Design a protein around this ligand. Structure first.
Ligand SMILES: CC(C)[C@H](Nc1ncnc2[nH]c(Br)cc12)c1ccc2c(c1)S(=O)(=O)CCC2
Length: 169
């Protein structure tokens, strides 16, 4: 069955969250769209992007290199739609700002706005981890910005608990 999400906590009518690895979720759920936390040259060298590319046995990286050759790099806050390979029908590669590299946190609203072109998505928490944004702020921007149905997979129980406690204040 498509979009078989299980064990999520509903935060708002359109935002759900789970303590889970996005790779394992994409295999279990078979979503229409999985979001990748990409960079502008689609080089999936580590973290969430590296994990999703490894799960496709590098097919995502080869396809990404061909897209960049023809179209050039993405902009920070932008996105592109490529194949989902074995993980989803489509992968939406979204570039959140990397605050640790000097990029503007205000671009996180533009990043989440890309999700609104898809009815349902499995996604990570944009610009969190080594991109350096405050993860509680990223969840607030997601809730305020995304209007379609988004299922967030956050692979850390400590962070999951802090995010749910923050939302429910
Ligand atoms: C905050 C962590 C827990 C989260 N990690 C994850 N969240 C969900 N599925 C996951 N599978 C694996 Br394998 C790790 C992973 C997270 C979310 C967003 C970003 C990162 C990491 S990053 O450091 O890769 C840079 C890009 C943005």
């Amino acid at each position: 069955e498509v979009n078989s999400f299980s064990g999520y906590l509903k935060l708002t009518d359109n935002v759900y969250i789970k303590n889970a690895d996005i790779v394992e979720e994409a295999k279990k759920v078979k979503p229409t769209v999985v979001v990748n936390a990409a960079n502008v040259y689609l080089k999936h060298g580590g973290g969430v992007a590296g994990a999703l590319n490894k799960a496709t046995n590098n097919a995502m990286q080869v396809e990404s290199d061909d897209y960049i050759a023809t179209n050039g790099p993405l902009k920070v806050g932008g996105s592109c739609v490529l194949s989902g390979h074995n993980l989803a029908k489509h992968c939406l590669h979204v570039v959140g700002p990397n605050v640790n590299k000097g990029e503007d946190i205000q671009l996180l609203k533009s990043a989440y706005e890309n999700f609104n072109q898809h009815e349902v998505l499995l996604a990570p928490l944009l610009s969190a981890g080594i991109f350096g944004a405050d993860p509680i702020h990223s969840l607030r921007v997601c809730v305020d910005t995304v209007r379609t149905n988004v299922y967030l997979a956050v692979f850390d129980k400590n962070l999951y608990d802090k995010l749910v406690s923050s939302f429910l204040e």
